[PDB]
Amino acid sequence: APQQINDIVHRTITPLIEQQKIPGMAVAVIYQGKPYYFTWGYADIAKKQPVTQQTLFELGSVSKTFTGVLGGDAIARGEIKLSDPTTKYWPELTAKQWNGITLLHLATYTAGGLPLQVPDEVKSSSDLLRFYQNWQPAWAPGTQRLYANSSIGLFGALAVKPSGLSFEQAMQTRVFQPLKLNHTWINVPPAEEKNYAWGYREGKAVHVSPGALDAEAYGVKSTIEDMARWVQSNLKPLDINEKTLQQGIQLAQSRYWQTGDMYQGLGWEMLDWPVNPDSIIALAARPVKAITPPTPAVRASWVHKTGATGGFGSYVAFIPEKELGIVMLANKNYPNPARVDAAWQILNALQ
Numbered sequence: 001a002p003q004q005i006n007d008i009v010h011r012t013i014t015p016l017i018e019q020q021k022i023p024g025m026a027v028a029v030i031y032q033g034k035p036y037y038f039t040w041g042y043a044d045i046a047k048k049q050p051v052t053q054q055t056l057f058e059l060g061s062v063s064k065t066f067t068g069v070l071g072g073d074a075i076a077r078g079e080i081k082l083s084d085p086t087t088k089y090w091p092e093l094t095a096k097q098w099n100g101i102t103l104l105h106l107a108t109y110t111a112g113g114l115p116l117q118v119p120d121e122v123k124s125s126s127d128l129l130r131f132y133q134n135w136q137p138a139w140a141p142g143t144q145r146l147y148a149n150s151s152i153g154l155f156g157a158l159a160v161k162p163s164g165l166s167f168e169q170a171m172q173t174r175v176f177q178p179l180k181l182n183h184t185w186i187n188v189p190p191a192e193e194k195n196y197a198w199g200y201r202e203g204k205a206v207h208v209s210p211g212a213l214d215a216e217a218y219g220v221k222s223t224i225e226d227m228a229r230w231v232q233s234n235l236k237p238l239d240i241n242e243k244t245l246q247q248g249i250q251l252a253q254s255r256y257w258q259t260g261d262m263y264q265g266l267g268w269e270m271l272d273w274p275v276n277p278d279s280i281i282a283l284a285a286r287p288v289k290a291i292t293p294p295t296p297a298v299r300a301s302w303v304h305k306t307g308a309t310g311g312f313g314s315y316v317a318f319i320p321e322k323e324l325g326i327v328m329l330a331n332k333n334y335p336n337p338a339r340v341d342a343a344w345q346i347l348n349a350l351q
């Protein structure tokens with residue numbers, strides 16, 4: 001690593017780990033389009049297994065970037081349109097509240113107040129149908145944003161329906177494989193368990209538990225190397241050989257809605273670059289303004305996503321205009337503001 005990167009990263013992350021009591025962490029900085037890796041601490045405290053560049057972390061909601069891109073790829077393929085009604089892909093969804101709710105609304109949390117969490121009791125396909133049928137919107141579609149697993153999760157399941165493929169199969173074949181993300185999993189195979197970090201919550205080792213729409217909303221596990229490659233792909237979509245995937249990436253970074261200083265993409269969220277971290281709560285309802293039509297991906301943006309599971313905390317942010325990015329993977333769920341502060345400190349220094 002160039003000394004500048006080594007220094008800013010270590011001097012920022014070391015105190016972070018100490019203040020937040022993070023067991024293990026991996027960080028990748030993409031600087032002029034080249035990745036640099038850093039690791040600290042334990043993937044498994046009990047077995048004294050260190051974090052390495054091959055350690056798997058639960059990405060939590062950073063998984064939504066993959067879902068948003070897979071969706072974009074499906075649009076590019078002509079398999080779905082975001083202007084399509086949800087019922088086009090789920091005709092059993094007959095309750096009248098669903099009239100006027102489009103795939104766009106699902107993808108961007110603007111359907112009218114879909115719940116943050118799918119209830120635990122919701123297991124089967126029939127359970128899900130009943131859940132969405134019984135749901136009562138607080139608001140008309142496209143008037144407020146409420147971040148929600150049950151929103152983008154449904155979008156993910158529906159977007160792959162035309163493909164004929166299972167969600168995991170579509171993600172594997174259309175996103176992971178093309179991008180050479182060969183150590184990124186919705187389901188961690190036994191051959192890779194040796195690398196799967198434990199999450200820590202209240203000092204107990206924990207992995208994410210199965211749930212409806214988990215794959216779609218929060219279920220991806222990945223290494224720091226793969227996430228660095230994910231950032232590279234999103235920084236420069238044009239280098240991507242597969243046409244629809246290149247387009248899907250671009251679509252995921254389009255600006256569909258504005259709330260305050262932030263713009264909603266598919267999975268990704270964006271703010272105009274430059275900006276201070278200050279500009280960058282269980283339930284937070286905000287009115288949205290439609291961007292009509294959506295603005296194509298803006299190079300001078302801070303594009304980011306935070307993610308958490310019970311035992312993991314992740315963050316990704318990049319700035320296309322400066323070919324610069326960062327991935328922070330930790331096996332403790334620590335406060336978002338601390339993640340954003342650290343990322344900003346590192347990227348600001350290098351930009």
Ligand SMILES: *[B]([O])([O])[C][N]S(=O)(=O)[C]C1=[C][C]=C(C([O])=O)[C]=[C]1
Pocket residue numbers: 059060061062117149207208209210211217218306307308309310
């Ligand atoms: B995202 O990281 O913003 C989604 N947040 S969340 O609360 O759904 C994360 C999550 C998912 C599963 C579990 C579990 O199985 O205990 C915990 C937290």
